[PDB]
RNA sequence: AUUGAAAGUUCUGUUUCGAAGAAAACCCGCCUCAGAUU
């Protein structure tokens, strides 16, 4: 299992609307960095036959796992909800082992943009290493799904529903999946939670947790 | 190529016309550059 670290450094701030008044999520979800990762191969098409569909050119790297938080300051505000945090640092980790470390860093210096046209994202460095997994009672910043227990004090805490891969295809709505976020809603901020769980990759001391 | 792809809240308008900081008032009343030298 071979992970990557890449620094991002943002321009004005992201914006992705929530499916279904157009309110905006608070940080882009796992669906939008798996597609700019994939931005850096598929470069230029913009349908391609998945053999039953035409739905994305993005349902081949739907098995990538992908977290990254914040470390600045912003604010979310609706004017199309945004979230401006210009000059702002993004971290994003990313955990696979489809391909090898070559390819990963290739795209991974690769990256543009996150959510729309307007939200370029320039990138500064990047690591690159193998990652191990515990069990162990650790402490994490990056967002992790409904289902994993906390054991610490719950003040820090936001629900948020995203969605699979299944929603990569036209004219289909994915399925929901509830997510919790450790963020401070108003100024935006990230804060450190201890957990327990199951699946927790060491991936330079910053515990990422899945499951 | 990312619930992503496509979208100008844009065009038109004077803060304008008029109204003396003006009239009265001494700086002025006394004081040696003076005694010695071819």
């Known amino acids: 299992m071979i992970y990557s670290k890449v620094f991002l450094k943002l321009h004005w701030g992201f914006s992705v609307v929530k499916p279904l008044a157009k309110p905006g999520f608070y940080l882009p979800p796992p669906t939008t960095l798996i597609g700019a990762l ?23 790297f739907r098995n990538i796992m992908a977290t990254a938080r914040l470390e600045s300051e912003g604010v979310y ?7 401006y945090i210009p000059n702002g640092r993004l971290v994003v980790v990313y955990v696979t082992d489809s391909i090898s470390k070559e390819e990963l860093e290739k795209l991974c210096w690769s990256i543009t943009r996150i959510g729309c046209k307007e939200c370029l994202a320039s990138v500064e460095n990047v690591e690159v290493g193998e990652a191990k997994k515990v069990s162990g009672r650790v402490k994490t910043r990056y ?26 295809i036209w004219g289909k709505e994915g399925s929901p999946v509830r997510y919790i976020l450790p963020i401070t809603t108003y100024p935006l901020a990230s804060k450190e939670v ?18």
């Open 77 to 83: 505000t609706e004017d199309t909800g945004k979230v």
């Open 194 to 211: 201890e957990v327990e769980a199951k699946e927790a990759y060491e991936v330079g001391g910053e515990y990422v947790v899945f499951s």
């Open 38 to 60: 994939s931005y850096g191969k598929f470069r230029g098409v913009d349908n391609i036959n998945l053999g039953n569909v035409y739905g994305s050119p993005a349902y081949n």
């Open 143 to 168: 967002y992790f799904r409904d289902t994993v227990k906390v054991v610490g004090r719950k003040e820090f805490l936001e629900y948020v529903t995203f969605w699979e891969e299944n929603g990569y």
